[PDB]
Amino acid sequence: IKELHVKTVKRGENVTMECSMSKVTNKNNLAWYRQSFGKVPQYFVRYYSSNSGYKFAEGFKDSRFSMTVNDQKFDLNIIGAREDDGGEYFCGEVEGIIIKFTSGTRLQF
Amino acid sequence: IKELHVKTVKRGENVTMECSMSKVTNKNNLAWYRQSFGKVPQYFVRYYSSNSGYKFAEGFKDSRFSMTVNDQKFDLNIIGAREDDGGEYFCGEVEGIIIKFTSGTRLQF
Known about the structure:
Two copies of one chain form a homodimer. Chain A is mainly β. Chain A is built from no helices and nine strands.
């Protein structure tokens, strides 16, 4: 069972959390989930064919977050990491009705 | 959006983790996920028409884990807790490739 990557970061730093397009089957079904400590995880951003390649959840108002999406990567970025950015982020692909998470990162300070 | 219920449990004790049925859209789309500490969450048990009401993931055979499934509840029971049961458990329903997690429990030994 795949271990989360642990990412340690200082307030104000820029971070990238990685998910690999390798062995992803259906990009259209790929997304990141974000879980703040002590809360249930939430759908956060999906792959989305367009000029950006990705589309944040409608409830999300934070321009510090972005993605680097291409052939190899579906990587989540943050500029100016802030205390409450910390948590666990999981990249999963849905198939049928099962979300299979292929990787995640614990972001901590 | 929703806080996990934090539960402290003793070795050999019984545990129930709650999930609400009476606001799910499509019951067969409901499932618990289990996250061991520092690991990616994994699909654990789904609702499965309605008989025992449920079916554990293929890679699972532990008899201590059961469910109480009815028109109100989709609750995950452990009889005789062991320390490896420790972790986070999240209950969610897939709506059109997005999983919404409606409750969860963190079990700590």
